[PDB]
Amino acid sequence: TRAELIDRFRRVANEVRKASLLGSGDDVESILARTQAFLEEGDLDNAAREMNALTGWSKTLSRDWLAEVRKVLEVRQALEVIQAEARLQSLRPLPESVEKARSEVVRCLREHDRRPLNCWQEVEAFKEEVRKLEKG
Amino acid sequence: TRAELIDRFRRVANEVRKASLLGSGDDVESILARTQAFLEEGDLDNAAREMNALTGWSKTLSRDWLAEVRKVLEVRQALEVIQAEARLQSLRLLPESVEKARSEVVRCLREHDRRPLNCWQEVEAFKEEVRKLEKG
Numbered sequence A: 001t002r003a004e005l006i007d008r009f010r011r012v013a014n015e016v017r018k019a020s021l022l023g024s025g026d027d028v029e030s031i032l033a034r035t036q037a038f039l040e041e042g043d044l045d046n047a048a049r050e051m052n053a054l055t056g057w058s059k060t061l062s063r064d065w066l067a068e069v070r071k072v073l074e075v076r077q078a079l080e081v082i083q084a085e086a087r088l089q090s091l092r093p094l095p096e097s098v099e100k101a102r103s104e105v106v107r108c109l110r111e112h113d114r115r116p117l118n119c120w121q122e123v124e125a126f127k128e129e130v131r132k133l134e135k136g
Numbered sequence B: 001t002r003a004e005l006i007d008r009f010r011r012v013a014n015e016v017r018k019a020s021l022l023g024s025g026d027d028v029e030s031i032l033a034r035t036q037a038f039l040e041e042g043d044l045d046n047a048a049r050e051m052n053a054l055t056g057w058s059k060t061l062s063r064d065w066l067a068e069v070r071k072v073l074e075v076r077q078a079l080e081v082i083q084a085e086a087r088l089q090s091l092r093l094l095p096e097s098v099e100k101a102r103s104e105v106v107r108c109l110r111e112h113d114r115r116p117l118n119c120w121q122e123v124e125a126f127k128e129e130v131r132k133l134e135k136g
Helices: A002-018 A027-040 A044-055 A060-091 A096-111 A116-135 B002-018 B028-040 B044-055 B060-090 B096-111 B116-135
Strands: none
Touching: A002 A027, A002 A044, A002 B060, A027 A044, A044 A060, A044 B060, A060 A096, A060 A116, A060 B002, A060 B044, A060 B060, A096 A116, B002 B028, B002 B044, B028 B044, B044 B060, B060 B096, B060 B116, B096 B116
């Protein structure tokens, strides 16, 4: 029953509006309105195509928040390298095991400057090396 | 290296402010200044302590933005279910494989009302079944 579908979208549309990352209330409101009307008009095909604008990865809307999530993860990783480096200097030649993990992180970051997240493992090894020094 | 450490954090702090997901907090500005101040005074231990507020998963700041990424994904998954339902109904009709999948997704979503992402596999099976019908 098509009338049952409209109620489902109406509530999903309500949850969409509450999620601030998904849109700035510009295209998102017009996408929902057109989809609501297409469903009310019985144009399931266009309604399905219309909502695709909000779920497809190619659409600009997914790129906006995906970049936002990337910037946040990258900044956190950059902070942890400084944090682990700070903890290291607080302790004050050191084991080659610890410093080899440090050179690897910088060597990796230089290799992947555009997408630093490719060095997440190298950063983890560096953090664990600093952790170990604290214990012995 | 403590001097070089101060310069790096100054660079990262500016990137923190640009990231609206991480820099929207009114508290984050006070953490960066205090973390920056600690570096100038040479209190590396305290500086790393302040930095944990921006990296720890427990801290409110990380809890704030992770919830946003999670609900964008939840609403996105909810839209795909309606989209697959619309296309299924677009095809006037169904194979048991189609019925098995739609009932699994609807059952799962109510059972995991708090965390709908636990149904991502069930949603894919439902989407793949709708694709199978469209192609034959």
